[PDB]
């Protein structure tokens, strides 16, 4: 099922990870590195761990002010803020598995492809 | 009046002693859970209290 | 709330009532109990009617008096910072400091700025 | 009884040094741990002192 | 109840019995000195004997 | 039988005295985390005003919440070293990119409760 | 300055011809474990099931799922093993491996085979409860893992790339399989590991991925301590196998100490003794001999109950060390002469204690 | 005997005040929490038909 509030940390509920840097390779490929909320290793979207997606045990999330997220975050964000330090928030988008096209973000009511959201 | 001073006496100072005990007692088991040493305990006293249903049940009844 | 049962005990060792807020008053049935339940002794006052006779003797002495004064001088200030108003303290501490730093450079030549300070929540 | 107890205490005295009790191990690697279960128990110690001294300071004897 | 003191209506008694409390005072005055003493050093953990020039060890004694 | 220098060595029962007995790593607030308690604010230097306050609703519905400036954050990591945050959403970005939630996170186990088949825990 | 470990056994036997017996064991340590990486807990299921009596095959089931310093480890296995002559079992199923984010799967074809260096007559004639049985075994492996991750086929490159390269593979793949202080336990029991030899290392096609395909064969030997070769009828109770049996334990270990739980029924368990009287399976050697290894670091305390209910009408015949109560039916073992034989085999010793019980 | 109702009456009335007035407005929403599963547990287990309340409590304001 789930694990305690003692083990790992109490916040979260299931095992967090963020993707932090999706740099490209001489294919074009997307090359996606996550680390977990703790921050000791380096670990790519593979199938094995993308199956933990599917039942929830862990769940996977981009910062706003990552170096390469290709769409222009902080116009968009600056907009939905105006209308209801501006400049300076910072949200934690969540990724979820579309089985289609894998890994994709629900930004704006559009869904997105890592690939596509990504440099 | 003397035999209700010193009963009284023992009384109220237990009472707080009691308390500070939980009090001084939960402030090490703050320092534990924040280190994580809370899930490495194996005694009963600690062991069978780490369960969060169980505590629910406990302060339940 | 340990204050309760901690006055549950001062209130029962001193031989007063608890079976009823008001035991021994000059009222209806106050002074009724000790037949109806047929009690060999008779308690000094119930919870009510404990702080009017066992005060008779507490003003009769001029040290017992004082500690009463004393006593509730120091209970009703907790109100002060147990109140949900901390953030209103350091407001007012401002306005202490600012008419102090006003007040001492129109009277004085010299500049008083002392900072009043204010206690945390916890 | 302050002879027998003197007897009591020195007996238990010796098999806890052959024998060291091995209950609430975690609390020999902190002060605190062990200082709040004193406190915890010296409390209940001192509610008992409390009690038998209204019961027995109006006693005949 | 142990002596020291007597509910005594005669002046003699509580002439003897004053005596007698300002014995166990002044008592009581030297064995506190000498814990202060021995609680000074033992914090400063300068154990050292001043009759035997060699200090002590807390672990093994 | 000769030996060498003697190992001056008073552990044990010995009369003698024993001894005593930089802009690299950055910091955000994840927005939708924040709670707006400020604990993080308190530990900012006074003269370097970086994080701060942002409103648009009532307080009791979480209508405010904290952000770092990073134009005066000066990353000295006090907000972070001490750990204040209770949710969370004060994190750290190390220089090479790896995203820190806190300081020290325990470490992961099962769960199982242990009983016994005869004692005082049985079944 | 000595530790405390409390413990409780418990073995329920059924009448007739029945091996069935139900084995429940709880143990709690207050050691810290010899692995040098804390906390490590771990969960290990079995299950087997008869698939027809005739053949004699059965469905093996095993799954892992441990947690080693916050690092989470699955191994999965799913067999079918069969006995096909008095030296040979085949075995045809596959499995999983996953560390982490990283996993991959595996199908083997894999027969045992298992030799005696003598069989002699006047051993039988003369020695009515054998234990030490000279042997060796033989594992011919057919392993075919698809190489689906980038690693995997970096993993097979090298592997490929060491063997053209490096003469002495046969002999420098023993340090590698027995990683740290598997090594060790070698020796400790009594148990030499033959050389491995590849009979091929080819790629071959499959519907999903590129498949590397690795054919070995290996032999390794024991002196009459390990069990597999001097019991190689006894831990494939196959035959008896009338209903599924399952044996499902676990433990938590950490800096602080150790806390196991096992629990599950199978045949085997009651053997023949001779003279009508039946007998408790004797000890298995190697588990004894391995747990010397890591039980001889703290002195500790032993507080172990080991109740044992036997079938209606069967009252033990002898027992050393003896039942300290009984019970009816039931008896117990508790202090005294048995608490001193636990923490012999808790520390390594294999003295035997034996329980004959007759109708 | 109306007088005397009135004194019992405003004086519970009074200190209720500090049970809202202190700053114990979250431990009021951990406890009512704790209220509402016990609750929910007890209907559980005591009637095969599972009745849930969730108990409110008020914010500072
Ligand atoms: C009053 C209600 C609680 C209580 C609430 C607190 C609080 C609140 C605090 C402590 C803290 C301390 N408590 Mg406590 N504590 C109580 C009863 C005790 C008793 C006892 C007499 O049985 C002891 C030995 C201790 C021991 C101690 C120390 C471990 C620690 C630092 C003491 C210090 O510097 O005091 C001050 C030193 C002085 C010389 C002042 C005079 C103190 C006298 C000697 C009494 C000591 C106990 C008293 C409660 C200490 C705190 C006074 C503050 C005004 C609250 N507590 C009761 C049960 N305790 C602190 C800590 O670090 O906790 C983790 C802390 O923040
Ligand atoms: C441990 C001592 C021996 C050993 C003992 C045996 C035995 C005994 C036999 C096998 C046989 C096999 N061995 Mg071998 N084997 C060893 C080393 C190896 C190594 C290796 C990594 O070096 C490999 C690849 C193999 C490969 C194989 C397979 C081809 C085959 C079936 C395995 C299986 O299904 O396991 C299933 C997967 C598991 C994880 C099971 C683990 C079970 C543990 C060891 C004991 C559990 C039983 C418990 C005590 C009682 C449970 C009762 C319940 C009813 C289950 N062996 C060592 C050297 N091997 C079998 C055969 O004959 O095939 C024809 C068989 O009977
Ligand atoms: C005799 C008991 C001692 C005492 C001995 C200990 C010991 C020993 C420890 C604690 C420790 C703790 N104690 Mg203390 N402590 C005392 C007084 C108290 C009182 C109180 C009633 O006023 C309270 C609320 C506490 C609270 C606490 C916490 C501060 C702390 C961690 C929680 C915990 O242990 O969960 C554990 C709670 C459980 C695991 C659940 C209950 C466990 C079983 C059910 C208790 C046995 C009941 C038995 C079945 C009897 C039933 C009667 C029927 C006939 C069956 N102490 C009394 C005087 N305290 C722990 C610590 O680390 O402190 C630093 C710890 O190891
Ligand atoms: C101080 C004395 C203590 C004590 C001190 C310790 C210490 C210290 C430790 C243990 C450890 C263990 N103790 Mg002990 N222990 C005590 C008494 C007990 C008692 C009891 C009271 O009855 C029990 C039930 C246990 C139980 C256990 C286990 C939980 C654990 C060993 C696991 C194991 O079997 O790995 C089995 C391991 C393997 C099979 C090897 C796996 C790896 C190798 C490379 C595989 C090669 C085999 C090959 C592949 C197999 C076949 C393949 C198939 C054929 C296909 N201890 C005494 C009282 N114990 C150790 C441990 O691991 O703790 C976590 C440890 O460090
Ligand atoms: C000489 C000391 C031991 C002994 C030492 C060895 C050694 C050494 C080896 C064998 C080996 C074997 N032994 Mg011899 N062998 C003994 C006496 C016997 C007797 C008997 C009737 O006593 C029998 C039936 C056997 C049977 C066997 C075979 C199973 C096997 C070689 C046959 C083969 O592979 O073709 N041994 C004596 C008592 N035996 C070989 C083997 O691989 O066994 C597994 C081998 O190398
Ligand atoms: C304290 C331990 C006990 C003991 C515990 C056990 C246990 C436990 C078991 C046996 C078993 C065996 N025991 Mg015993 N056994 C003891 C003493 C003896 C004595 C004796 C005269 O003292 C003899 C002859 C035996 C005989 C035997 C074998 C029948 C059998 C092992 C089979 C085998 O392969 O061995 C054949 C011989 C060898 C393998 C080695 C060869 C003999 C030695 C190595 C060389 C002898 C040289 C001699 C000095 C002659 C001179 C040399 C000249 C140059 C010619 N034991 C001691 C006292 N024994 C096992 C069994 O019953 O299985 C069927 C078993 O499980
Ligand atoms: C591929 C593996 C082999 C195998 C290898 C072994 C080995 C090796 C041993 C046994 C042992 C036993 N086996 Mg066998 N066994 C297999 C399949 C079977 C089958 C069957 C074919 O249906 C049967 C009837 C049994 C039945 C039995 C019992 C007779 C006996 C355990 C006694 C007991 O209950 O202890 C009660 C105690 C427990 C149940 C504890 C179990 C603890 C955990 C679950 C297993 C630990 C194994 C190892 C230390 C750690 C795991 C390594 C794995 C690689 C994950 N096994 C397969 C074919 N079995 C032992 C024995 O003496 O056999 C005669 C023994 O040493
Ligand atoms: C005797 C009790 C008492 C006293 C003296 C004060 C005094 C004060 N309060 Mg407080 N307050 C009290 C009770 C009291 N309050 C209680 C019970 C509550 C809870 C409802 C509050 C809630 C509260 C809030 C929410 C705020 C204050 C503020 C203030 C300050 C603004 C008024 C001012 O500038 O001068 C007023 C005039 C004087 C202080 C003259 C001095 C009167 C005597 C001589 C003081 C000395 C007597 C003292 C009791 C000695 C103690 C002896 C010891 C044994 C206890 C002032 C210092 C405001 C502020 O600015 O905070 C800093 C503020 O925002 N009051
Ligand atoms: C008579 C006064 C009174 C009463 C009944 C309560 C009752 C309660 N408090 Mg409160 N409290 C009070 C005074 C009171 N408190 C004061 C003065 C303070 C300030 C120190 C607090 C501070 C406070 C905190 C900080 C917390 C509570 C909590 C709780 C609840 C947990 C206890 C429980 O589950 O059952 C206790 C047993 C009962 C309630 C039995 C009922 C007793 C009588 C019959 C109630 C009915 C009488 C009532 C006065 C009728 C009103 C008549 C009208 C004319 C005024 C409980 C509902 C905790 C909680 O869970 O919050 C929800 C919590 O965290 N208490
Ligand atoms: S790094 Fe220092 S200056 Fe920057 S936000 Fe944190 S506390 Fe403030
Ligand atoms: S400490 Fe945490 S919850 Fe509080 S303002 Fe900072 S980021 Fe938000």
């Known amino acids: 099922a789930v694990s305690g509030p003692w083990s790992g940390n109490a916040v979260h509920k299931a095992e967090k990870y963020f993707i932090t840097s999706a740099k490209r390779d001489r294919d074009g490929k997307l090359q996606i590195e996550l680390v977990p909320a703790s921050g000791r290793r380096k670990l790519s979207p593979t199938p094995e761990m993308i199956r933990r997606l599917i039942d929830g045990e862990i769940e996977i999330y981009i910062l706003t002010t990552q170096p390469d997220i290709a769409i222009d975050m902080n116009k968009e964000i600056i907009d939905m803020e105006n209308r209801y330090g501006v400049k300076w928030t910072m949200r934690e988008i969540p990724v979820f598995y579309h089985e289609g096209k894998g890994l994709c973000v629900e930004l704006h009511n559009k869904i997105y492809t890592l690939d596509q959201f990504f440099k | ?61 | ?122 | ?61 | 109840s142990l002596g020291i003191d007597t509910y005594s209506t005669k002046t003699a008694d509580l002439e003897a019995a004053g005596a007698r409390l300002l014995g166990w005072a002044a008592f009581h005055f030297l064995v506190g000195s000498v814990l202060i003493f021995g609680g000074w050093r033992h914090w400063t953990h300068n154990l050292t004997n001043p009759f035997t020039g060699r200090c002590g060890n807390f672990r093994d004694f | ?123 | ?359």
């Not at chain 7, 139900?22 to 698939?51: E, G, H, I, T, Y």
């Not at chain 7, 089931?61 to 002559?85: H, M, P």
Request: net charge neutral; with cysteine; glycine share 10%.
């Open chain 6, 1 to 123: 039988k000769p030996r060498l220098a003697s190992l001056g060595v008073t552990l044990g029962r010995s009369g003698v005295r024993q001894e005593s007995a930089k802009a690299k790593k950055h910091y955000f607030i994840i927005e939708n985390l924040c709670v707006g308690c400020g604990l993080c604010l308190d530990k900012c230097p006074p003269k370097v005003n970086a994080i701060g306050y942002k409103f648009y609703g009532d307080v009791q519905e979480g209508g405010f919440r904290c952000y770092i400036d990073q134009a005066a954050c000066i990353s000295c990591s006090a907000c972070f070293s001490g750990d204040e945050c209770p949710s969370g959403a004060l994190i750290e970005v190390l220089p090479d990119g790896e995203v820190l939630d806190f300081s020290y996170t325990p470490p992961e186990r099962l769960d199982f409760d242990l009983r016994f088949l005869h004692r005082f825990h049985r079944e």
């Open chain 2, 1 to 61: 009046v003397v035999t209700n001073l010193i009963v009284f006496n023992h009384i109220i100072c237990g009472v707080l002693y009691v308390f500070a005990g939980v009090y001084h007692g939960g402030q090490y088991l703050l320092k534990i859970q924040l280190n994580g040493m809370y899930n490495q305990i194996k005694s009963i006293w600690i062991t069978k209290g780490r369960d969060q249903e169980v505590q629910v049940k406990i302060l339940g009844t």
């Open chain 3, 1 to 122: 709330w340990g204050i309760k049962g901690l006055s549950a005990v001062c209130w029962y060792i001193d031989g007063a009532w608890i079976a009823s807020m008001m035991y021994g008053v000059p009222a209806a049935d106050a002074k009724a109990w000790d037949s109806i339940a047929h009690l060999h002794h008779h308690y000094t006052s119930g919870i009510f009617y404990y702080f009017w006779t066992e005060t008779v003797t507490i003003f009769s002495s001029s040290h017992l008096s004082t500690i009463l004064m004393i006593g509730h001088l120091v209970w009703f200030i907790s109100f002060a910072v147990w109140f949900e108003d901390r953030g209103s303290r350091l407001e007012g501490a401002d306005i202490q400091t600012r008419t102090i730093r006003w007040l001492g450079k129109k009277f004085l030549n010299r500049d008083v700025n002392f900072r009043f300070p204010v206690l945390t929540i916890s």
């Open chain 7, 1 to 359: 300055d000595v530790t405390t470990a409390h413990s409780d056994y418990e073995i329920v036997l059924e009448g007739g011809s029945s091996s069935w017996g139900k084995v429940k064991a709880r143990a709690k340590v207050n050691a810290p474990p010899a692995s040098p990486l804390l906390p490590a807990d771990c969960d290990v299921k079995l299950n087997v099931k008869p698939l027809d009596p005739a053949k004699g095959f059965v469905r093996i089931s095993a799954v892992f799922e441990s947690i080693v310093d916050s690092t989470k480890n699955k191994l999965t296995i799913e067999a079918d093993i069969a006995n096909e002559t008095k030296e040979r079992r085949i075995s045809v199923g596959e499995g999983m491996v996953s560390v982490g984010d990283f996993s991959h799967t595996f199908s083997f074809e894999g027969s045992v085979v298992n030799l005696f260096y003598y069989r002699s007559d006047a051993v039988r004639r003369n020695v009515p409860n054998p234990i030490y049985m000279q042997g060796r075994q033989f594992h011919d492996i057919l392993m075919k893992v698809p190489l689906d991750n980038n690693d995997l086929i970096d993993t097979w490159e090298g592997t490929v790339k060491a063997i053209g390269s490096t003469g002495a593979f046969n002999d420098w793949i023993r340090d590698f399989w027995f990683i740290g202080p598997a090594f060790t336990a070698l020796n400790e029991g009594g148990q030499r590991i033959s050389r491995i030899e590849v009979n091929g290392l080819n790629t071959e096609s499959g519907p999903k991925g590129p498949v590397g395909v690795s054919r070995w064969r290996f032999s390794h030997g024991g002196s009459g301590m390990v069990d597999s070769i001097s019991r190689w009828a006894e831990l494939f109770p196959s035959d008896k196998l009338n209903r599924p049996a399952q044996v499902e334990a676990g433990f938590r270990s950490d800096s602080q100490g150790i806390e196991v739980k096992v629990d599950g029924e199978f045949p085997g368990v009651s053997v023949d003794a001779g003279g009508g009287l039946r007998r408790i399976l004797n000890h298995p050697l190697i588990p004894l001999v391995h747990h010397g290894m890591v039980g001889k670091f703290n002195n500790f305390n032993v507080d172990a109950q080991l109740k044992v209910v036997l079938p209606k009408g069967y009252k033990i015949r002898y027992a050393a060390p003896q039942y300290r109560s009984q019970n009816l039916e039931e008896y117990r073992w508790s202090g005294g002469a048995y608490a001193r034989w636990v923490e012999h085999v808790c520390k390594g010793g294999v003295g035997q204690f034996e329980i004959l019980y007759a109708q």
């Open chain 4, 1 to 61: 009884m302050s002879f027998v107890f003197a007897v009591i205490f020195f007996a238990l005295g010796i098999y806890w040094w052959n024998n060291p009790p091995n209950a609430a191990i975690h609390l020999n690697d902190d002060m605190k741990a062990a200082f709040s279960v004193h406190l915890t128990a010296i409390g209940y110690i001192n509610i008992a002192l409390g009690c038998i001294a209204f019961v027995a300071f109006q006693q005949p004897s």
